[PDB]
């Protein structure tokens, strides 16, 4: 339409952790608009051009001893150092989920406001597992350090039927079981 | 791609010519730990647990963003003034908990695939704008170097209020109203 | 108690 012109620049200093502190990897990304043109990979140890737009940057950054040494050391001063603070805060955050069944013929099991992301939801009709008519949304990120997931079950409810939703989460010692009975 | 148990963006740096505007933030597993108010020179953590034990000097963000401003001018000339491509944003509206008539809740408007990172996100209670109870997050990064933004609206569920999330973006032809 | 850092952005070639 009548959109103004815009030029975007991004820089991302990303750390990848595995096996606690055993495996650490640093990848800094220099992005013009949405094109990553240069990067530093700690597994490589030098800057590399990603597109024809960053040979001048990679050659200059690799020729400057101060830049390459500072970037090489950031695997310890940034990734490993800040991870020790994650062990004491983020990696210990446990928020237990709230499980609710709502009729919609569809039956929706809502699992809301939990952290971390690992979650397990299963449907049962009279203690027998249901899989054929089960839809689950992807993990919904609320953006406030809590997650959400919706698991729906297509049902033809009879009399005496007891539909249950079984939920497992790392913050729970036992699974949460919520029942639902037709009226 | 890179396989890892935990991914942290210790430096989501952003600077664009429209404004001009910038943003600095740290992320861990897709969630925002803090952002630095570049105008106030202040670190704003996103959880009480972070404000208690964690510290970050806002001067580091002002120093990095000043470099991105210098780098942007250099790559603009090198690319023969190649402008950014406006993408089509995807909007989704939902509640943080199952809405029970009479119990306070919160509506969540997820604006995904935002590029360039310039967007207007506002709510509408009926056909009129809302001011109280509206808050949003910072531009959160994606692996494809686009962004997504989340806006929140606290509300009291009633049988007569039908809410809308109006999103304005250059990749759209008209303001997108997603209904709830 | 101790300030943590981010990644340092390296400068481009332009003067």
């Amino acid at each position, epitope marked *: 339409r009548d959109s103004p012109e815009d030029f975007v620049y991004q820089f991302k200093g990303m750390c990848y952790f595995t096996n606690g502190t055993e495996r650490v990897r640093l990848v800094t990304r220099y992005i013009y608009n949405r094109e990553e043109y240069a990067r530093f990979d700690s597994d490589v140890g030098v800057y590399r051009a990603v597109t024809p737009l960053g040979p001048p940057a990679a050659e200059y950054w690799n020729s*400057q001893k*101060e*830049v390459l040494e*500072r970037t090489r*050391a950031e695997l*310890d*001063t*940034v990734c*490993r*150092h800040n991870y*020790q603070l994650e062990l004491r805060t983020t990696l210990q955050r446990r928020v237990e989920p709230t499980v609710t069944i709502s009729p919609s013929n569809l039956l929706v099991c809502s699992v809301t406001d939990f952290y971390p992301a690992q979650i397990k939801v299963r449907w049962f009709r009279n203690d027998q597992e249901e899989t054929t008519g089960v839809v689950s949304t992807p993990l919904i990120r609320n953006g406030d350090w809590t997650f959400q997931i919706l698991v729906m079950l297509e049902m033809t409810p009879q009399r005496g039927d007891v539909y249950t939703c079984h939920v497992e989460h790392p913050s729970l010692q036992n699974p949460i079981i919520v029942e639902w009975r037709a009226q | 791609d890179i396989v890892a148990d935990h991914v942290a963006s210790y430096g989501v740096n952003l600077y664009q010519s429209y404004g001009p505007s910038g943003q600095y933030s740290h992320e861990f597993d897709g969630d925002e730990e803090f952002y630095v108010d570049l105008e106030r020179k202040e670190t704003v953590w996103q959880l009480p647990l972070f404000r208690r034990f964690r510290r970050f*000097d806002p*001067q*580091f963000a*002002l*120093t990095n963003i*000043a*470099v991105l*401003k*210098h780098n942007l001018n250099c790559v603009i000339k090198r690319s023969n003034s190649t402008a950014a491509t406006n993408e089509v944003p995807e909007v989704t509206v939902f509640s943080k908990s199952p809405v029970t008539l009479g119990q306070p809740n919160t509506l969540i408007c997820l604006v995904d695939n935002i590029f360039p990172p310039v967007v207007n996100i506002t709510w509408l209670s009926n056909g009129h704008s809302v001011t109280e109870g509206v808050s949003e997050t910072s531009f959160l990064s994606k692996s494809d170097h686009s962004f997504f933004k989340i806006s929140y609206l606290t509300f009291l569920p009633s049988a007569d209020e039908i809410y809308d999330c109006k999103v304005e973006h250059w990749g759209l032809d008209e303001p997108l109203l997603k209904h709830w | 108690g*101790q*300030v*943590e*850092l981010g990644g*340092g952005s*390296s*400068p481009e070639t332009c*003067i």
Partner: T-cell receptor, first 109, second 110 residues
Framework: MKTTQPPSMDCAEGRAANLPCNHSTISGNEYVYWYRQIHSQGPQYIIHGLKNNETNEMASLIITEDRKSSTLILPHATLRDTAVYYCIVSHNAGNMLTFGGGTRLMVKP | GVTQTPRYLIKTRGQQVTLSCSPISGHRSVSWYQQTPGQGLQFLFEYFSETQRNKGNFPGRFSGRQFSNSRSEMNVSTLELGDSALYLC??????????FGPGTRLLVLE
């Protein structure tokens, strides 16, 4: 600041000068920097390091394993080495430098 | 490496001065400090890409500027007796090791 040094120190010319520096509250993302300033001059950069040992043409820097202290080794003290030596810390994040009292080294022949 | 002009300076109260600094060839960051026997090494401001990036706690009468070739100037207006000091210039490639110049020894008299 974060570093403490002896205010004065003597050394014989031609021998090695070991200058101590204590910094128990140093962080893991902070480098140890060493500067010196001859009278009526500006500060001269000497050496810096993060962990353990670093050397150059001017001196050697040995940081202990726990990083709570470090030593600046001047291999063969000369008359020109008579100056005030500053042991400081820095994040190398483009921020200001902070100097302390420093050690007034006197090289006596 | 780093050069500063002038080397020495004599001024009276109320006057102004302009101190110049040329960083090491290739360096983009220029820092200004004030060194006194009483207060030590006090930071003024740091410039990168013709813009002030870091700011100290000195009043508004202490101002600086950086040019296209990374050379930097520093101005002190309505000088005071307590402004007598060695004004040092430190150059850095961008954020790493800072290399100081000889400095300008300023003396303010009545």
């Amino acid at each position: 600041m974060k570093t403490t040094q002896p205010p004065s120190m003597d050394c014989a010319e031609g021998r090695a000068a070991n200058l101590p520096c204590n910094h128990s509250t140093i962080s893991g993302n902070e480098y140890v920097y060493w500067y010196r300033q001859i009278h009526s001059q500006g500060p001269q950069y000497i050496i810096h390091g993060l962990k353990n040992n670093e050397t150059n043409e001017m001196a050697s820097l040995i940081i202990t394993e726990d990083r709570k202290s470090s030593t600046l080794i001047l291999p063969h003290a000369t008359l020109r080495d008579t100056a005030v030596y500053y042991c400081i810390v820095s994040h190398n994040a483009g921020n200001m430098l902070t100097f302390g009292g420093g050690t007034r080294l006197m090289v006596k022949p | 490496g780093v050069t500063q002009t002038p080397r020495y300076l004599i001024k009276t109260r109320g006057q102004q001065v302009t101190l110049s600094c040329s960083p090491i060839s290739g360096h983009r960051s220029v820092s200004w400090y004030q060194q006194t026997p009483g207060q030590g090494l006090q930071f003024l401001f740091e410039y990168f890409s013709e813009t002030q990036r870091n700011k100290g706690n000195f009043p508004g009468r202490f101002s600086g500027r950086q040019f296209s070739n990374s050379r930097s100037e520093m101005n002190v207006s309505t000088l005071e007796l307590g402004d007598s000091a060695l004004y040092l210039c430190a150059s850095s490639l961008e954020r790493e090791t800072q290399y100081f110049g000889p400095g300008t020894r300023l003396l303010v008299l009545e």
